[PDB]
Write a protein that binds this DNA or RNA. Structure first.
Lengths: 119, 217, 45, 99, 64, 116
RNA sequence: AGAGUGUAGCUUAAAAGCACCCAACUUACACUUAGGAGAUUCAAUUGACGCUCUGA
């Protein structure tokens, strides 16, 4: 029922969501965020974290993104969050590690598409 | 202050022979030849080898080996010029063919009175002389030959100033195009050095620091 | 460092085989080159 | 005249049937992977070496021009002057067998 | 009637005479990174944010 | 707006340069445009060495105007690659040329010829 | 002998981020994608290990 910021049509990304999944792939680390429109990071999962980093071979590969997708999805089911928006750039859309990340999220339990606002 | 005005030069030989490969470069080169073959597209040499013996099997059922054999024996005809005139000599330090795959540097004994120093070859300049022309005069003076070198610019390369009367020492860098180095068994003490003997022949701080502008590769 | 620009491969894809045929122009100077029909040595008269 | 030679020859179309077979094993691609990994190691160490040489020699020549400037204020003006002998500058690549 | 800016203007310190000597954004992603960093900084104009807003561990971890 | 202190906060055309002899005047000296021809009997060593030159030049902050190639010749075939360069220093002429000298693979020659 | 000292290239980063390299698309570059390598000199804020500058 709550408002989404409907506007922002000339600017990337759109602010029309309640929760956004924002992947930050650095040189060394894959990072995954779940945010509000406020910018309040609700649920994160980075490989800069000893609980997940030590079970990985390399913190940047497709295995790192499937791992951070399983871990992020399990962390978000227990936060009462079931609907994100993931809006990628058209090269990051067609990357293998984000297709593997999205398949990890959808198989985890999270639908990557928000329901409409009830007016 | 009376400055003892000193110019010099650091002479270079470009290697005519290429360096040998790393064994890791051997495995990578072999791998690139394999995967290079794997993506090629029907060379006529095998079209004149593969289907031709199929058609000869069809004719016998009812020459590429000579080309390869002639190429093999003609490969056995011309012996290669050996890349190592380096270990057989082992003491021809004055000769220009001491090494072939590395750079070679001219390096001359000088006997002074207060000193007695093995020195990268110098000259004495005049304020009327150009520093590049100081090094050009340095070329055909000390060796007494008919070489052909080549400079690059009036930019210097390495400066070292020692006193005991002020002084300064300027190090340029030349490059041998060719050489008509006549009578290589000179009375002078020029020695060609790869890199390692420069830390052997040259001890002090004005001479153990030449290799930081010697093109080491 | 005379081996950096040597570890190559044909960067095209519509290319046939090439073979490491040693070439001499006139001077007894052998260079490894790739040419059609696997020759071993060359000399230009 | 804009005539180049990147145009592909027409014969490379029809008989493309000599090698459709590309099969390998596990350990062949493992050793191929170790060659790419350790070869990027080797090449990275190489450009660390060359970057060290450009840094060392470039600071060497800048320190040299500073000392030549402060010990001769009429020679660093001509040390910057360029040579007209570097228009037709050439060097052929190295060989194997000396003549 | 120009009035002078209150704080420092953006795009001031990078504004040089030789832009072709300045290395550029080769991508879209780097501009998105720097651009989000400039979004999060406190500014002096009116912005959207005003209105809508030990050693053994590294030892065993490195060996681990 | 023209009277507000944030006037011209959104302007950008001074930040894009949306648009030959040598410059050797009195102290700051630099070559004009150049040409570096690479001739070889190999497409591979000439193309790949032109790559190594071009990535050196981008790794040493040099304007590289073009990197085109010249047509071949019926002879064996001789291949050429032209990698243009504009603007060097006194030290950087020497230090820049010594690496191109000291990195040639096999029999491929150079040229520091200029334009026209 | 003294002085300045000190995280991988750079950091008023605290084991990070940019830098960097190979492979692929590109003539090539660039983008992008797949990978790779990385470090807080050694002991108790302090001394001693390595570098730079000034000395003989």
């Amino acid at each position: 029922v709550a408002r989404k910021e409907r506007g922002w049509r000339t600017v990337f990304p759109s602010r029309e969501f309640w929760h956004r999944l924002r992947v930050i792939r650095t040189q060394h680390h894959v990072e995954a965020l779940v945010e509000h429109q406020n910018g309040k990071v609700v649920v994160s999962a980075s490989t800069r974290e000893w609980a997940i980093k030590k079970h990985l071979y390399s913190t940047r590969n497709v295995v790192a993104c499937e791992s951070i997708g399983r871990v992020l999805a399990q962390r978000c089911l227990e936060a009462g969050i079931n609907f994100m928006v993931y809006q990628p750039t058209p090269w990051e859309a067609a990357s293998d590690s984000m297709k593997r990340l999205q398949s990890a999220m959808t198989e985890g339990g999270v639908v990557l598409r928000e329901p409409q606002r009830i007016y | 202050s009376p400055w003892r005005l000193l110019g010099a030069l650091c002479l270079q030989r470009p290697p005519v022979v290429s360096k040998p490969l790393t064994p890791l470069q051997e495995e990578m080169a072999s791998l690139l030849q394999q995967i290079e073959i794997e993506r090629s597209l029907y060379s006529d040499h095998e079209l004149r080898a593969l289907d031709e013996n199929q058609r000869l099997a069809k004719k016998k059922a009812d020459l590429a080996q000579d080309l390869e054999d002639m190429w093999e024996q003609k490969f056995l005809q011309f012996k290669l010029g050996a890349r190592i005139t380096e270990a057989d000599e082992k003491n021809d330090r004055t000769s220009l063919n001491r090494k072939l795959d590395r750079n070679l540097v001219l390096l001359v004994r000088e006997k002074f009175g207060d000193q007695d120093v093995w020195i990268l070859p110098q000259a004495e300049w005049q304020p009327g002389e150009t520093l590049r022309g100081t090094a050009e005069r340095t070329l055909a003076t000390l060796s007494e030959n008919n070489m052909e070198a080549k400079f690059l610019g009036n930019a210097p390369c390495g400066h070292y100033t020692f006193k005991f009367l002020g002084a300064k020492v300027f190090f340029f860098k030349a490059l041998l195009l060719t050489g008509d180095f006549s009578q290589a068994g000179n009375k002078g003490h020029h020695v060609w050095v790869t890199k390692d003997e420069l830390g052997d022949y040259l001890k002090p701080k004005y001479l153990a620091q030449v290799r930081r502008f010697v093109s080491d590769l | 460092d005379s081996s950096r620009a040597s570890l190559t491969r044909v960067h095209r894809q519509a290319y046939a085989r090439l073979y490491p045929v040693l070439l001499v122009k006139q001077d007894g100077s052998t260079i490894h080159i790739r040419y059609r029909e696997p020759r071993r040595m060359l000399a230009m008269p | 005249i804009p005539i180049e030679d990147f145009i592909t020859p027409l014969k490379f179309l029809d008989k493309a049937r000599e090698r459709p077979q590309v099969e390998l094993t596990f350990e062949e691609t493992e050793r191929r992977a170790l060659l790419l990994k350790k070869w990027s190691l080797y090449k990275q160490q190489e450009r660390k070496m060359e970057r060290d040489t450009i840094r060392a020699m470039l600071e060497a020549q800048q320190e040299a021009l500073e000392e030549l400037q402060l010990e001769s204020p009429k020679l660093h003006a001509e040390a910057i002057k360029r040579d007209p002998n570097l228009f037709p500058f050439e060097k052929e690549g190295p060989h194997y067998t000396p003549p | 009637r120009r009035t002078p800016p209150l704080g420092p203007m953006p795009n001031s310190d990078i504004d040089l005479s030789n832009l072709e000597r300045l290395e550029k954004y080769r991508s879209f992603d780097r501009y998105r990174r720097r651009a989000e960093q400039e979004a999060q900084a406190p500014h002096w104009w009116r912005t959207y944010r005003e209105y809508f807003g030990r050693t053994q561990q590294l030892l065993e971890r490195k060996q681990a | 707006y023209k009277t507000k202190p944030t006037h011209g906060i959104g302007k950008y055309k001074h930040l894009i340069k949306a648009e030959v002899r040598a410059i050797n005047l009195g102290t700051d000296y630099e070559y004009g445009v150049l040409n570096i021809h690479l001739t070889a009997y190999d497409m591979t060593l000439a193309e790949s060495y032109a790559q190594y030159v071009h990535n050196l030049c981008n790794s040493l902050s040099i304007k590289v105007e073009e990197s085109y190639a010249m047509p071949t010749k019926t002879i064996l075939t001789t291949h050429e690659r032209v990698v243009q360069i504009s603007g060097l220093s006194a030290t950087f002429a020497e230090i820049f040329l010594e690496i191109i000298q000291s990195s040639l693979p096999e029999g491929v020659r150079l040229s520091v010829k200029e334009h026209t």
